Design a protein around this nucleic acid. Structure first.
Ligand SMILES: Nc1nc2c([nH]c(=O)n2[C@H]2C[C@H](O)[C@@H](COP(=O)(O)OP(=O)(O)OP(=O)(O)O)O2)c(=O)[nH]1
Ligand SMILES: [Ca+2]
Ligand SMILES: [Ca+2]
Ligand SMILES: [Ca+2]
Length: 326
DNA sequence: CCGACCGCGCATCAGC
DNA sequence: GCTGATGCGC
DNA sequence: GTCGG
């Protein structure tokens, strides 16, 4: 965190553009600059020094000069004073409340945690659960708890069908000492790109995890993606563990490497890598990497036997998960 | 100067 | 009910 | 907000 002051500033600007302005390209511009600066191995001395980095342009260089001189950014000091922006920014921290709903809630005079808690009937299901665990979802998960959580998920999945493979991805797979939440990649041989020889594959796993009281709430659920809430068991007289967010993604078994690349991230890493894919005439998603024809139409799925094959196609040296934390 | 900015699953809703 | 757009999220 | 063409 050589440049923590700067990257914090940029992230707050990023958050303003997403939540308030609803300017997603600006949000992404700010996040990209923050990311490139975060890995830059020097304490930055000027906006000019920063503008050398890709993604840092004229306007952010100016802000970095202002920040270095004064320790502050006038633009942000103002945003912080503005009640409508403060309220919107607050409300979007509830899972399920995005920029649009936040602004609509403010319009109706719902703008504090108390307001939310007295108007539960104005929330959809996701939002109500996001509100219920507002505090818990703020907390990070120690790797040691992630490890206990992995063990429960892996062993319960095995009890359902020993042919399931469950892989914990996200920042955990990147080696992080703490994680925002748990991400499980699920495969089963019955579900391939060619056929689905077995229904309820995700359901069965979700039910078993609910049965043992690991999964406690559901935010959304379909055939291939679960988004919900889980909690470690606690011992006699112990305070309960906080509730945690969990995502489970069922991916065609033959498309595992594209899936685990996607689910391992980071999100900014994924965005960067997919952009680069396009520059190189490929398109990457969680299933496949395909060539872009002479017109911009995706061709057939290229063969993939490893994460490295994907990097190879786009002429990137292989990067271990622990170095994908952009 | 300006087009393009990654890709997609689930929930909600409007129109038909 | 279906379809397509939008919101929110990974 | 930034960048390549
Ligand atoms: N292609 C793409 N992938 C994304 C996006 N957002 C996003 O989270 N992903 C991927 C990469 C992430 O590592 C993975 C899991 O999301 P996550 O919110 O749990 O993030 P994480 O594990 O890296 O980090 P964290 O929980 O410690 O905060 O989903 C996106 O916008 N585009
Ligand atoms: Ca995570
Ligand atoms: Ca997650
Ligand atoms: Ca995230």
């Amino acid at each position: 965190t050589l440049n923590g002051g700067i990257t914090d500033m940029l992230t707050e600007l990023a958050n303003f553009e997403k939540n308030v302005s609803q300017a997603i390209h600006k949000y992404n511009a700010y996040r990209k600059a923050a990311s490139v600066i975060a890995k830059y191995p020097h304490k930055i001395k000027s906006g000019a020094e920063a503008k050398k980095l890709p993604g840092v342009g004229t306007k952010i260089a100016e802000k970095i000069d202002e920040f270095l001189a004064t320790g502050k950014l006038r633009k942000l000091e103002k945003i912080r004073q503005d009640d409508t922006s403060s309220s919107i920014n607050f409300l979007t921290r509830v899972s399920g409340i995005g920029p649009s709903a936040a602004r609509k809630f403010v319009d109706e005079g719902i703008k504090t945690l108390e307001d939310l808690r007295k108007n539960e009937d104005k929330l959809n299901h996701h939002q109500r659960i996001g509100l219920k665990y507002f505090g818990d979802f703020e907390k990070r998960i120690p790797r040691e708890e992630m490890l206990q959580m992995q063990d429960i998920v892996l062993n319960e999945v095995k009890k359902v069908d020993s042919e399931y493979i469950a892989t914990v991805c996200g920042s955990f797979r990147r080696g992080a000492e703490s994680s925002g939440d748990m991400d499980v990649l699920l495969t089963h041989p019955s579900f391939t790109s060619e056929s689905t020889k077995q229904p309820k594959l995700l359901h069965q796993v979700v039910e078993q995890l609910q049965k043992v009281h690991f999964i406690t709430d559901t935010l959304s659920k379909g055939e291939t993606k679960f988004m919900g809430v889980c909690q470690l068991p606690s011992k006699n007289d112990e305070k309960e563990y906080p509730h945690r967010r969990i995502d489970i993604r069922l991916i065609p078994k033959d498309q595992y490497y594209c899936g685990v690349l996607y689910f391992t991230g980071s999100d900014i890493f994924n965005k960067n890598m997919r952009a680069h894919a396009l520059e190189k005439g490929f398109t990457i998603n969680e299933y496949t990497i395909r060539p872009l024809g002479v017109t911009g139409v995706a061709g057939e799925p290229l063969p993939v036997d490893s994460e490295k094959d994907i990097f190879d196609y786009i002429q990137w040296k292989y990067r271990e998960p622990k170095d994908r934390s952009e």
